[PDB]
Amino acid sequence: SMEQVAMELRLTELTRLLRSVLDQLQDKDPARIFAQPVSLKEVPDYLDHIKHPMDFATMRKRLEAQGYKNLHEFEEDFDLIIDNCMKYNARDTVFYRAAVRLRDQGGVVLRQARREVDSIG
Numbered sequence: 001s002m003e004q005v006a007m008e009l010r011l012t013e014l015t016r017l018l019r020s021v022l023d024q025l026q027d028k029d030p031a032r033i034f035a036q037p038v039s040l041k042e043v044p045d046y047l048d049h050i051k052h053p054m055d056f057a058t059m060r061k062r063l064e065a066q067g068y069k070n071l072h073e074f075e076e077d078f079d080l081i082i083d084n085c086m087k088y089n090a091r092d093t094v095f096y097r098a099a100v101r102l103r104d105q106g107g108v109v110l111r112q113a114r115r116e117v118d119s120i121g
């Protein structure tokens with residue numbers, strides 16, 4: 001139907017927009033600490049601690065599969081990355097500190113993204 005095409009045109013642009021947001025967020029992780037899923041070969045006990053793992057590569061896969069219906073779903077996953085890290089790692093680690101910085105620096109980008117998504121509809 002013409003409707004479903006229109007719906008799919010918007011989803012495509014939401015995806016285009018989120019792709020830009022994603023690059024900007026990941027630019028704030030220069031050490032690439034959150035770039036890939038935590039390896040179970042390197043951290044065997046990880047899933048005993050963290051029930052819903054997340055990282056930028058996994059978000060990107062879901063993104064290109066147009067798996068985010070809105071910004072809120074996208075933000076949930078970004079928050080997972082941060083919150084998981086701040087629990088698994090103690091406060092005085094490079095890991096925890098990287099999460100704090102990514103959260104702080106990401107807030108700017110996500111504040112703008114909300115206003116654009118709302119604006120463009």
Ligand SMILES: CC(=O)NCCNc1ccccc1
Binds near residue numbers: 033085095
């Ligand atoms: C994002 C995160 O939680 N990173 C710290 C836990 N993962 C880890 C993996 C390999 C070597 C050392 C640590």
